[PDB]
RNA sequence: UUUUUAUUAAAAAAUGGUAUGUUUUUUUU
RNA sequence: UCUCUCUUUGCCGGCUUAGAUCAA
């Protein structure tokens, strides 16, 4: 991460670890290899929170651009 | 009131600029051990000379 | 060239420039005084000019403190000065004055510095020279420059935007006037 | 994507932009400001006029700036919650700032960055952090009192007094008015201050002021002598002293800037004190550096002294040698000023001591940060060298003791030699045999018997018990890993315990309040029956001494191996293996790295001069040490290759074909860069499996920098004599000079030159220096070596030759055969000039010519204020001249890759882009020169045909109005001057203008035409005979041809080499006519003339005097 | 004081210890009205060594006018004249060789043609007089006469030390001639007489009227001098082409030619390094070929005055004949 | 050509003079004058263009086809430096400067000097090789320790000089800096 | 005790050097 | 209850190597 990390979430159905930071990008660390595999890019400013849907394979992020 | 820059002219009188500092909170005192140290140096210096 | 004796006009321009600029822009301040360098301006401000300096007469308490400290730390006036409260030059001058006064009273009931001439005074610690009635012509011009300097403000290139607005106002007024005369 | 953007639009709105290492700071600031806005909006309760965010943000910015400048930042009217939040966020920002500083400095030290901006930013951060730490240290010193106790100060003063009275030291007096040598000391100080500058125009206000003061001193010196003495007597407070750090990319050197007049006074006091101390014998021989030897000779003397100790190498009865190198860890920082003043009062007059003590208590200021130096020692003063030298003679007395110091130094009237004793009884009476102090590093040599060593280890293990045998886990901190093991220290338990015991004892010898010894800086190397070789590191050299007793192995006596003799038996007893320490290799690497990124490295000549200076400074210090080090050789190859790569990059092409070694290594007067070379050598290799564990024979050679073709660029080391031969020659020459001086004194004859002509430039203090013009002034300049070493704390420019001075030592290196050898190696002057554009200038011979350094126009604009673009172009001018000079080889035709494009209105064919060469060639042809030249040549041809207007083929002759662009089009060429014959002739195959046995009776032809084409030849293909042959055989035989006659004549001109030729069918009369007329033409055209003169103007290559 | 160098035709202002007579005069200067004291800043032992009386100006000036005077009286051999102090022989031969190359003296050392005698009759130097005497062949005597009057009278421009210097430049800004200072002076003189001799105009233009009046007297007396030889003085060039005036000047300043060097200095025809004075307009114009009149030499640089540009082919055609 | 407005220079000598302006603009042009553009616009051609003239030779029509001359193909810089570079002839200046015909002149003067005669002006010409004084007094003896008095391309006129820029190949000062003998006692 | 073999590269754009901003009407009653 | 005046009256561009340098 380039800047401060603001949210972590260990997926209970996948071997992943999603993270987000004030550096405007969301990452998906693969815990079987300890390397970033996915990047989620659309955000106009820093991201302050991150959560995972308990059932669906969908994650939700909220940030400084007044948009979740 | 900053000691470095201001975008406009905005002249500030010297008293206000002086009042914006922490100089008073920082004490200026010297340890007691200097008094015995220097005197010892002065004592032996005279003793060796005599 | 550069230097001199810090006439009163220079000192007051220095005070005004410090008021308008701050204590961390000595290069910009020295641009006002063409005969002085930023180091000289800083030395004078921190040795004679800034209001924190106590120019009053020496009390007995601080005098005994000065004697005690000068006994404790031989030389080392730059560190004795903050404790005593005066500047280093003031403390050293007061110490020498006390020693000379004691020698004078020594003579009533009864050379190393003598073999050479008197100590040339430091330029930044001497009192400002009182101004004459007609301060030459160069000092007048530098005072005028400083006067225009202190009330400039408005940045540097902000004089373009307002000028373009005034020109646009004149052009539109002329256009409306031509429409009206038609 | 291109078509979508074309038919749709930008769709700029609603797109995100990733942070890309340049927006990092400006985005972190935005996030911090947003967070502070949220905190403000929260902690302020309801209905309290929330519109107060901007002022708190201003307070936060001011608090951050105050933190950076180390200012308290107490705001009186600020509420407590706001103040606490601001403090918290400022601490967060400060911690981020410091972490980034650490990361960037580590990266810079490794070498992973080449930014100038990053290096400067990190230098600023390091300066700020160090100054904060130093201010805290001084404040703590004032709070906690004098760290040195009263008892320690009394003991130190008593020992120094006893030592000084034992050697009957006569205290230095204040210099009287009637002092004979004042003018000489003054001029010496003034010269040392002038040596810092040049006649360049970059002098700022302070530099110009000090130069003017120096000039005023030269015009009339005596009133300034009076002023200097008066200031010494009366002045006790001084101006502020600027402070800044000089980046070595591995450590930072503190550089102090002092006021000019105070600098004059300090320099005079320095000279006077060093002359008086040397005249009165204050420093007892073992303090270093000294005027006697350079550092390499000091290493040699240490090796010889170690070898010459009595029974030094014998290990039968359990005797052990410990040679402990160490440095006094933080010893300049712990020099108590009052104790220093009391000590300095012992050596000299009270006035001088007081002046020197008060000069060290100054106000150090960097930018907006300032503090009062009241505890440390300021190394930027001109006399700080002397002040440190006698404060470090105190520590020598503490370490050795008065009796051992007296034994080592000997009687004051008859002092001992450097590393010798009066007799063996006193030499062997103490474990300490040898001792020296190089500024702050201490080298001691211990000679223990069995009982002494056993008792020492038992004492050490009493107080530091070692049940787990952990004393051997971390002993050599990778210090001596350069040597192959079995040449390192074998970590036997007894030897390791002995070394650690010696370190423990010596460290306990010194009080902790003024200095300390760190184990990470100390390495005691033991010689015993277990390990045979002593190892130590003096200055930049790593030395390994292996006595002949313990060798039991045969190795080739390299040039980098010193043979140590024994004066008792006059035979060699040990061999010392010399190599460059890892710190020296890093220093050279960092020096090259800081050469590459610098303001002046824009011009090729400047960077070549920088490379030459760095290379000479390296290879004259470690003469043969740098040869025995295989790591330094590959570093030299790498750094020379990257120096060349800088020049290659500046011309926007780093192809190796474009840059033969003649471009870089040819001497300056021939138009090259004049680069000294050492990366052009083979690097020895041996099997890597046994390279780390034993010294195996050199079985393979890995090539160094490759030279395309067969070229042998001379090595620089082969023109520098190795240190050992210089030392042997010095001893022999000085002994014979002493003998001849004695034979001159026994009679009344005056010793003269042409009597020492054989040993003229020989001896480390060169014999030249005896008959020197200014040897009388130099006879008073003393302590110059320590002063030159300490000059690193006063000037921001690195002194490469810090270890020597040409006035006192003489020119120790004489590299003049390198020029002639590198001229021969490249193929001679003719072979070098075939690459350049010398022929196009039309100059008759090379001997008379000379280059003009500046065009005068440059001299006009060297002070005027110019925009950055104008300064860049003015700097590019010499690069453009250089590129034009080497045009034939840089714009060659045998290139690996490159689009072949023709310059418009011109026949020059460009491979690649190379903007510098293109713009130079455009300037050379700034008007329509190519086509004008073609028309002028054909015009002069028609005139000379008008002369001979009555000949064969005179029935018709006409030169057609050709297509304009027929000069600069080689795809096809239209006709030229036409000839048709009135009768029939017999001609044969066309031939050149060189053959007289030419048959012309094979075929029967009637008509011919003559045409001329212009060629700008390059280095690879310039033989005009083949060019004209092929052009004729291609153009005439071509199925499409706008030449009326089936056969004719084609002639060519090589503009770059001003040659010419022809090929065509010949009719008697025409061939001799063109032979006689072409030569007259080629020296007569206005067009060729103006082309030659404009080329000469561009090259700035003028004729003879 | 001033010392002139014949080998280089330069003049320098050098410091010299005073003579004994000068010291006595300075001591006696004080004490006219009441008793006075002198404090000479040296020792009597220093006084014991200086030479008694300063050497004569006949021994410290240019003898070319002197040789013209004697040759006009009819003295073939210069050694026959009763000099009080013998002048330097090397100076006499230098002046005579200069006069020979000027054409006033023949191979035998006698006055050449009416030219030599007419030059002898002229008060001015032979160099300036040659242009005046040859101007009759070209019908442009008037402007060369004005040039000579300006040169002999002195500097016709006044340079204040205060801010009016910028005003002076602006006052001069109307009359900057591309061809050098000499034609600028000609234009200034023409408009000066064309401005009714108005003294307020001279104040406004910062022009020295006294020098212009003296030039008027000089030109009137030289008009009488030419009329002594029955030479008309109504000859003016009706065309703007100043080239033939420049031919006459190059005939008058044959020795004083120089061409620009790359270093910013100029190479005299005699291989001398000289520097242009800052006063001249063509200070940085980088004119390829230049012609000057007077040379004043300082401790480092030799400065030339009265700068005027020239063309190479005029010089080439003049030297070949 | 109005020489442009000359008031811009005023005083303010070299090290404060703004920058040279070709067209009252702060720019450089020419490859060897510091500009990043040479020719018309980084090109050889010109604004109008350039065409050859008609050619015709018939032993009487080529007579109208004259030769080529120096000036017709050069430009303003080329002619300027052609004027600058013309230096030759000289002769007479070198003969009588620095005596020959002057010896005949001395024959006219009836020199008959035998032993030559000199004047105190020549002692002042010796003063040309003595001093100009250095602001000192008459009796000031001064001091002797305080008196003082290869090629290739250039490093750049703004890159200055230093220890870096000297000749590594040195063979000067053969004997002029060295004494021929030294007192031993 | 006879013989060896080992071969990096490599050019284009923007920074970077003729800034930029301005600029013409068909209805009144 | 008007008019005027005074006084009380809580009060409504950022970042970095101070960005970097500076003699008529």
Curated annotation (Swiss-Prot), chain A:
Q: List residue spans for each WD repeat.
A: 1-30, 42-68
Family according to the record: Belongs to the WD repeat PRL1/PRL2 family.
Query: This protein is called what?
Result: Pre-mRNA-splicing factor prp5
Native organism is: Schizosaccharomyces pombe (strain 972 / ATCC 24843)
Oligomer status and interactors: Belongs to the 40S cdc5-associated complex (or cwf complex), a spliceosome sub-complex reminiscent of a late-stage spliceosome composed of the U2, U5 and U6 snRNAs and at least brr2, cdc5, cwf2/prp3, cwf3/syf1, cwf4/syf3, cwf5/ecm2, spp42/cwf6, cwf7/spf27, cwf8, cwf9, cwf10, cwf11, cwf12, prp45/cwf13, cwf14, cwf15, cwf16, cwf17, cwf18, cwf19, cwf20, cwf21, cwf22, cwf23, cwf24, cwf25, cwf26, cyp7/cwf27, cwf28, cwf29/ist3, lea1, msl1, prp5/cwf1, prp10, prp12/sap130, prp17, prp22, sap61, sap62, sap114, sap145, slu7, smb1, smd1, smd3, smf1, smg1 and syf2.
The uppermost taxa in this organism's lineage are: Eukaryota, Fungi, Dikarya, Ascomycota, Taphrinomycotina
What this chain does, per the entry, is described as: Required for both cell cycle progression at G2/M and pre-mRNA splicing. Interacts genetically with the PRP4 kinase.
Compartment annotation:
Nucleus
Curated annotation (Swiss-Prot), chain D:
Summarize the subunit comment.
Belongs to the 40S cdc5-associated complex (or cwf complex), a spliceosome sub-complex reminiscent of a late-stage spliceosome composed of the U2, U5 and U6 snRNAs and at least brr2, cdc5, cwf2/prp3, cwf3/syf1, cwf4/syf3, cwf5/ecm2, spp42/cwf6, cwf7/spf27, cwf8, cwf9, cwf10, cwf11, cwf12, prp45/cwf13, cwf14, cwf15, cwf16, cwf17, cwf18, cwf19, cwf20, cwf21, cwf22, cwf23, cwf24, cwf25, cwf26, cyp7/cwf27, cwf28, cwf29/ist3, lea1, msl1, prp5/cwf1, prp10, prp12/sap130, prp17, prp22, sap61, sap62, sap114, sap145, slu7, smb1, smd1, smd3, smf1, smg1 and syf2. Interacts with prp1.
What subcellular compartments does it reside in? Nucleus
Q: Which domain of life is it from?
A: Eukaryota
**Function of this protein?**
Involved in pre-mRNA splicing. May be involved in endoplasmic reticulum-associated protein degradation (ERAD) and required for growth at low and high temperatures. Required for pre-spliceosome formation, which is the first step of pre-mRNA splicing. This protein is associated with snRNP U5. Has a role in branch site-3' splice site selection. Associates with the branch site-3' splice 3'-exon region.
Which lineage?
Eukaryota, Fungi, Dikarya, Ascomycota, Taphrinomycotina
Spell out the protein name for this chain: Pre-mRNA-splicing factor spp42
From Swiss-Prot, chain E:
Please give the positions of the paired cysteines in each disulfide bond.
none
- Cellular location(s): Nucleus
Report the domain of life of the source organism.
Eukaryota
Q: What does the similarity note say?
A: Belongs to the DEAD box helicase family. DEAH subfamily.
Q: Name the job this protein performs.
A: Pre-mRNA processing factor involved in disassembly of spliceosomes after the release of mature mRNA.
Q: What protein name is recorded for this chain?
A: Putative pre-mRNA-splicing factor ATP-dependent RNA helicase C20H4.09
Q: What organism is recorded for this protein?
A: Schizosaccharomyces pombe (strain 972 / ATCC 24843) (Fission yeast)
Organism phylogeny: Eukaryota, Fungi, Dikarya, Ascomycota, Taphrinomycotina
Covered residues, full protein: 325 to 645 of 647
From Swiss-Prot, chain F:
Provide the protein's localization.
Cytoplasm; Nucleus
One of its GO biological process terms is: mRNA cis splicing, via spliceosome
Q: Which domain of life is it from?
A: Eukaryota
Q: Any idea which GO molecular function terms this record carries?
A: protein-macromolecule adaptor activity; RNA binding
Q: Which UniProt keywords apply?
A: Cytoplasm, Nucleus
Keyword hit for rRNA-binding? no
GO cellular component, as recorded: cytosol; nucleus; spliceosomal complex
Q: What is this protein called?
A: Uncharacterized protein C20H4.06c
Please name the source species.
Schizosaccharomyces pombe (strain 972 / ATCC 24843) (Fission yeast)
What part of the full protein is here? 25 to 234 of 534
């Amino acid at each position: 991460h380039i800047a401060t990390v603001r949210g972590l979430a260990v997926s209970p159905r996948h071997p992943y670890l999603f993270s987000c930071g004030e550096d405007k990008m969301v990452k998906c660390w693969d815990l079987e290899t300890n390397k970033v595999i996915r990047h989620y890019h659309g955000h106009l400013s820093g991201v302050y929170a991150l959560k995972l849907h308990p059932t669906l394979d969908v994650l939700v992020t909220a940030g400084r651009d007044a948009v979740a | 009131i900053s000691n470095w820059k201001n975008p406009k002219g905005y002249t500030i009188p010297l008293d206000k600029r002086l009042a914006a500092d922490g100089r008073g909170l920082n004490d200026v005192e010297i340890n007691d051990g200097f008094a015995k140290f220097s005197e010892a140096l002065y004592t032996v210096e005279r003793q060796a000379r005599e | 060239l550069k230097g001199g004796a810090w006439k009163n006009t220079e000192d007051e321009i220095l005070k005004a420039a410090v008021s308008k600029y701050g204590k961390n822009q000595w290069a910009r301040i020295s641009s006002l005084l063409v005969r002085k360098t930023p180091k000289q301006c800083k030395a004078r401000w921190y040795e004679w000019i800034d209001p924190s300096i106590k120019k009053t007469e020496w009390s007995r308490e601080e005098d005994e403190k000065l004697l005690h400290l000068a006994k404790l730390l031989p030389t080392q006036w730059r560190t004795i000065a903050p404790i005593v409260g005066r500047t280093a030059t003031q403390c050293l001058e007061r110490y020498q004055k006390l020693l000379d006064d004691l020698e004078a009273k020594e003579n009533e009931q009864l050379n190393s510095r003598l073999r050479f001439g008197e100590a040339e005074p430091n330029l930044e610690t001497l009192p400002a020279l009182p101004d004459a009635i007609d301060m030459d012509e160069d000092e007048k011009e530098m005072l005028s420059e400083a006067r225009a300097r202190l009330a400039n403000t408005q940045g540097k290139k902000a004089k373009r935007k307002d000028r373009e607005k005034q020109l646009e106002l004149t052009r539109r007024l002329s256009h409306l006037q031509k429409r009206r005369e038609l | 994507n291109l078509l979508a953007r074309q038919f749709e639009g930008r769709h700029s709105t609603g797109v995100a932009k990733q942070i890309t290492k340049q927006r990092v700071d400006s985005h972190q600031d935005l996030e911090l400001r947003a967070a502070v806005m949220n905190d403000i909006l929260d902690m302020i309760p309801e209905g309290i006029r929330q519109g107060k965010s901007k002022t708190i943000l201003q307070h936060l910015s001011e608090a951050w700036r105050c933190w950076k400048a180390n200012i308290p930042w107490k705001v009186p009217g600020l509420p407590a919650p706001i103040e606490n939040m601001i403090l918290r966020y400022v601490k967060s920002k400060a911690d981020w700032w410091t972490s980034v500083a650490h990361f960037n400095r580590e990266r810079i030290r490794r070498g992973a960055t080449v930014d100038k901006t990053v290096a400067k930013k990190n230098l600023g951060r390091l300066t700020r952090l160090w100054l904060k730490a130093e201010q805290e240290r001084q404040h703590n010193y004032l709070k906690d009192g004098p760290y040195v106790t009263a008892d320690e100060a009394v003991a130190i003063y008593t020992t120094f007094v006893h030592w000084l009275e034992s050697r009957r030291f006569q205290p230095i007096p204040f210099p009287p008015l009637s002092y004979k040598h004042d003018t000489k000391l003054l001029v010496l100080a003034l010269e040392r201050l002038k040596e810092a500058y040049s006649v360049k125009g970059r002098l700022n206000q302070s530099q110009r002021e000090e130069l003017a003061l120096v000039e005023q001193a030269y015009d009339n010196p005596h009133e300034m002598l009076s002023q200097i003495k008066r200031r010494l007597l009366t002045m006790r407070t001084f101006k502020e002293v600027g402070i800044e750090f000089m980046d070595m990319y591995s450590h930072l050197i503190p550089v102090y800037s002092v006021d000019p007049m105070e600098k004059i006074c300090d320099a005079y006091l320095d000279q006077y004190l060093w002359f008086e101390a040397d005249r009165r014998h204050l420093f007892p021989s073992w303090v270093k550096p000294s005027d006697s030897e350079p550092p390499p000779l000091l290493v040699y003397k240490w090796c010889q002294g170690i070898n010459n100790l009595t029974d030094v190498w014998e290990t039968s009865n359990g005797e052990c040698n410990v040679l402990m190198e160490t440095r006094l860890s933080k010893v300049f920082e712990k020099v108590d000023l009052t104790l220093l003043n009391r000590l300095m009062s012992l050596l000299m007059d009270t006035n001088l001591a007081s002046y020197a003590s008060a000069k060290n208590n100054v106000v150090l200021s960097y930018k907006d940060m300032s503090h009062t130096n009241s505890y440390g020692l300021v190394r930027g003063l001109q006399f700080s060298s002397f002040i440190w030298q006698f404060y470090g003679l105190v520590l020598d007395l503490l370490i050795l003791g008065l009796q051992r110091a007296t034994e080592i130094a000997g009687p004051a009237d008859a002092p001992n030699d450097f590393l010798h004793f009066k007799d063996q009884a006193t030499e062997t009476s103490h474990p300490i045999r040898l001792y020296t102090r190089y500024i702050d590093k201490v080298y001691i040599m211990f000679r223990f018997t069995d009982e002494e060593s056993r008792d020492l280890i038992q004492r050490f293990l009493n107080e530091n018990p070692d049940p787990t045998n952990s004393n051997v886990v971390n002993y050599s901190k990778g210090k001596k890993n350069c040597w192959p093991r079995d040449a390192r220290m074998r970590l036997m338990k007894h030897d390791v315990n002995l070394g650690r015991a010696v370190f423990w004892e010596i460290r306990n010898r010194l009080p902790r309040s003024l200095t300390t010894l760190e184990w990470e800086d100390t390495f005691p190397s033991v010689y015993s029956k277990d390990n045979p070789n002593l190892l130590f590191s003096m200055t930049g050299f790593e030395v390994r001494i292996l006595p002949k007793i313990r060798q039991n192995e045969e190795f080739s006596l390299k040039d980098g191996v010193w043979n140590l003799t024994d004066n008792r038996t006059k035979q060699r007893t040990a061999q010392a293996f010399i190599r460059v320490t890892e710190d020296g290799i890093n220093q050279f690497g960092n020096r090259i790295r800081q050469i590459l990124m610098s303001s002046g490295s824009t011009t090729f000549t400047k960077i070549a001069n920088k490379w030459n200076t760095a290379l000479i400074a390296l290879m004259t210090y470690y003469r043969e040490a740098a040869i025995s080090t295989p790591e330094l050789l590959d570093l030299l190859v790498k750094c020379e290759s990257k120096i060349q790569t800088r020049v290659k990059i500046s011309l926007n092409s780093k192809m190796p074909s474009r840059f033969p070694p003649a471009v870089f290594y040819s001497p300056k007067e021939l138009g090259g860069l004049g680069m000294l070379s050492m990366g052009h050598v083979l690097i020895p290799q041996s099997d890597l499996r046994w390279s780390k564990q034993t010294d195996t024979g050199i079985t393979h050679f890995r090539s160094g920098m490759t030279t395309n073709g067969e070229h042998l660029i001379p090595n620089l080391y082969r023109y520098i004599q190795p240190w050992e031969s210089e030392f042997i020659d010095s001893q022999r020459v000085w002994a014979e000079y002493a003998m001849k001086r004695q034979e001159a004194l026994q009679q009344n004859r005056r010793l003269t030159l042409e009597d020492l002509e054989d040993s003229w430039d020989r001896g480390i203090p060169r014999i030249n220096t005896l008959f020197q013009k200014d040897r009388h002034t130099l006879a008073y300049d003393k302590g110059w070596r320590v002063r030159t070493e300490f000059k690193q704390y006063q000037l921001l420019k690195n002194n490469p030759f810090w270890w020597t001075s040409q006035r006192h030592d003489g020119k120790l290196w004489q590299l003049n055969n390198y020029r002639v050898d590198v001229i021969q190696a490249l193929g001679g002057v003719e072979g070098i000039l075939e690459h350049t554009m010398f022929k196009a200038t039309g100059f008759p011979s090379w001997e008379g010519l000379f280059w003009e350094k500046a065009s005068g126009f440059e001299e006009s604009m060297k002070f005027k204020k110019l925009t950055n673009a104008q300064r860049s172009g003015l700097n590019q001018i010499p690069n453009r001249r250089f590129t034009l000079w080497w045009s034939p080889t840089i714009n060659r035709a045998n290139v690996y890759v490159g689009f072949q494009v023709q310059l418009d209105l011109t026949g020059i064919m460009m491979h690649g882009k190379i903007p510098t060469l293109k713009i130079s060639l455009i300037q050379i042809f700034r008007s329509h020169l190519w086509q004008k030249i073609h028309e002028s040549v054909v015009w002069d041809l028609c005139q000379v045909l008008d002369q001979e207007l009555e000949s064969l083929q005179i029935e018709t002759v006409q030169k057609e109005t050709i297509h304009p662009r027929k000069s600069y089009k080689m795809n096809s060429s239209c006709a030229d001057i036409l000839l048709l014959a009135a009768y029939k002739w017999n001609v044969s195959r066309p031939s050149l203008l060189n053959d007289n046995r030419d048959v012309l009776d094979n075929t029967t032809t009637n008509k011919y035409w003559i045409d001329v084409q212009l060629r700008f030849g390059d280095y690879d293909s310039h033989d005009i005979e083949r060019y004209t042959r092929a052009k004729f055989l291609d153009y005439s035989t071509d199925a499409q041809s706008m030449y009326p006659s089936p056969t004719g004549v084609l002639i060519g001109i090589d503009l770059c080499y001003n040659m010419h030729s022809a090929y065509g069918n010949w009719i008697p009369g025409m061939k001799p006519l063109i032979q006689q007329s072409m030569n007259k033409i080629m020296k007569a055209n206005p067009a060729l003339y103006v082309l030659r003169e404009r080329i000469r103007k561009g090259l700035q290559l003028y004729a003879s005097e | 004081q001033r010392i002139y160098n014949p080998y280089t035709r330069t003049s320098k202002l050098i410091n010299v210890p005073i003579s004994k007579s000068s010291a006595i005069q300075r001591s006696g200067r004080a004490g006219r009205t009441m008793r006075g004291k002198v404090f000479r800043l040296y020792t009597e032992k220093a006084y014991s060594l200086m030479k008694e009386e300063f050497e004569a100006d006949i021994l410290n000036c240019d003898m070319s006018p002197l040789v013209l005077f004697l040759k006009g009286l009819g003295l073939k051999n210069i050694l026959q004249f009763p000099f009080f102090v013998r002048p330097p022989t090397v100076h006499l031969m230098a002046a005579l060789e200069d006069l020979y190359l000027l054409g006033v003296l023949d191979e035998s050392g006698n006055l050449t043609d009416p030219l030599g005698i007419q030059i002898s009759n002229s008060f001015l130097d032979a160099n300036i007089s040659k242009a005046l005497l040859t101007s009759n062949q070209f019908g442009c005597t008037h402007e060369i006469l004005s040039i000579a009057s300006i040169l002999t009278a002195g500097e016709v421009f006044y340079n204040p030390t205060s801010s009016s210097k910028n005003d002076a430049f602006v006052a001069h800004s109307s009359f900057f001639a591309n061809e050098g200072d000499i034609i600028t002076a000609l234009n200034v003189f023409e408009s000066f007489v064309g401005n009714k001799k108005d003294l307020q105009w001279c104040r406004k233009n910062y022009l020295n009227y006294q020098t212009l009046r003296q030039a008027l007297d000089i030109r009137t007396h030289l008009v009488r001098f030419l009329n002594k030889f029955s030479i008309p003085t109504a000859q003016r060039l009706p065309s703007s082409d100043c080239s033939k005036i420049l031919k006459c000047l190059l005939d008058g300043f044959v020795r004083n030619v120089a061409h620009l060097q790359n270093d910013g200095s100029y190479k005299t025809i005699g291989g001398k390094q000289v520097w242009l004075d800052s006063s001249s307009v063509l200070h940085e114009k980088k004119t390829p070929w230049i012609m000057y009149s007077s040379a004043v030499e300082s401790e480092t640089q030799i400065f030339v005055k009265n700068i005027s540009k020239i063309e190479s082919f005029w010089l080439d055609k003049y030297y070949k004949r | 050509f109005d020489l442009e407005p000359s008031r811009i220079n005023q005083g303010v000598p070299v090290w404060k003079q703004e920058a040279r302006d070709e067209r009252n603009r702060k720019r450089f042009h020419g490859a060897f004058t510091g500009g990043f553009s040479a020719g018309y616009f980084n090109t050889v051609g010109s604004k109008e263009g350039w065409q050859p003239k008609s050619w015709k030779s018939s032993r009487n029509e080529n007579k109208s086809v004259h030769g080529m001359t120096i000036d017709d193909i050069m430009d303003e810089e080329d002619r300027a430096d052609q004027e600058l570079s013309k230096v030759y002839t000289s002769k007479i200046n070198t003969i009588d400067t620095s005596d020959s015909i002057g010896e005949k002149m001395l024959k006219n003067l009836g020199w008959n000097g035998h032993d030559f005669v000199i004047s105190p002006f020549q002692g002042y010409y010796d003063d040309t090789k003595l001093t100009n004084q250095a602001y000192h007094g008459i009796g000031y003896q001064a001091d002797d320790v305080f008196q003082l008095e290869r090629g290739g391309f250039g490093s750049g006129v703004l890159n200055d000089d230093g220890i870096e820029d000297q000749d590594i190949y040195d063979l000067g000062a053969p004997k002029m800096r060295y004494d021929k003998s030294i007192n031993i006692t």
